[PDB]
């Protein structure tokens, strides 16, 4: 919009020259530096350096704002595509921030395969179905494989090294560690706003192991709900999409059936704001895609 150095009110060419000559080629250069560093580096009157510095900060939107108009600025709906039209549609557009979305099914139904894909797909620009955001992969079992990622990255013509740089990975070794990790997400995501996706494949893993009996069922429920509340609150309070998987106060629950060959049926089970349907997608070298026929 009011983007370049020229666009700011009645600035002289005489001036604009001295700015480029002083290495303040952009609005950002100005908006960071002080009028004192500017008024010597540019070689201009101090007052003038200050005028400009504010007219930049004002040209970019660096001002006071009511907390309401910051809400209205960023409360908008944000969704990440799965790679499958069909599946995005079932999801009414895709994976949504401030929502925990669960995918459960038997091994190789594509619950873990989605996670990988989405940890790439967040990094895409919005026009391409992403949020230009990072992702956190929490792994209970060692299911995570960077090579699955690398493949999905190649498949979009993306920079492989970079894609992998935008995914933080940890392995939950233990139910207790798994809670520490989610507990410490709050700091990490405040330290790094660009994180728009947390996945936890696959949550119950460690709870079933450590609390196996049907007397441990309640003993492990109280433990598992506490843990999902945490996740749910991260999503809401930090505007992040949370995905959990599962083998066989929460959110959306989608089951995943194996169908003919590479193709999978995702049916929705619990999501009262979503239509009751099921749809078919496919698992490919490239990652999640739509099916043939
Ligand atoms: Cl899977």
What distinguishing features does this structure have?
293 residues, alpha/beta, DNA polymerase, domain 1, Rossmann fold, 2 domains, nine-stranded mixed beta sheet, two-stranded antiparallel sheet, 12 helices, 42% helix, elongated, binds chloride ion, dna binding protein, DNA-binding protein
Write the layout of secondary structure elements.
Blueprint: H1 13-21, H2 27-32, H3 35-43, H4 46-59, H5 67-74, E1 79-80, H6 85-90, E2 95-96, E3 100-105, H7 111-121, E4 134-139, H8 146-154, H9 160-165, E5 167-171, H10 175-191, E6 195-201, H11 205-210, H12 216-238, E7 241-247, E8 252-258, E9 263-270, E10 278-283, E11 288-290
Parallel strand pairs: 3-7, 3-8, 4-5, 4-6, 6-7
Antiparallel strand pairs: 1-2, 8-9, 9-10, 10-11
Helix pairs in contact: 3-4, 7-8, 10-12
PDB class: dna binding protein
Keywords: DNA-binding protein, RAD51, DNA-binding protei
Assembly: monomeric
Bound molecules: chloride ion
| Whole-angstrom Rg | 24 Å
The number of helices is: 12
CATH class of the largest domain: Alpha Beta
- The total domain count is 2
- First CA to last CA: what distance? 46 Å
Number of strands: 11
Helix percentage range: 40-55%
Q: What spatial form do the alpha-carbon principal axes imply?
A: elongated
Characterise the protein shown here:
The protein is elongated and about 80 Å long. It has two domains: 12-74, 5' to 3' exonuclease, C-terminal subdomain (DNA polymerase, domain 1, Orthogonal Bundle); 76-293, P-loop containing nucleotide triphosphate hydrolases (Rossmann fold, 3-Layer(aba) Sandwich). A nine-stranded mixed beta sheet has the order 5-4-6-7-3-8-9-10-11. 42% of the residues lie in helices and 20% in strands. Strand 8 and strand 9 (263-270) form a beta hairpin. The two termini are 46 Å apart. With 293 residues, the protein is α/β, with parallel strands linked by helices. The protein binds chloride ion. It holds the Pfam family Rad51. This is DNA repair and recombination protein RadA. Belongs to the eukaryotic RecA-like protein family.
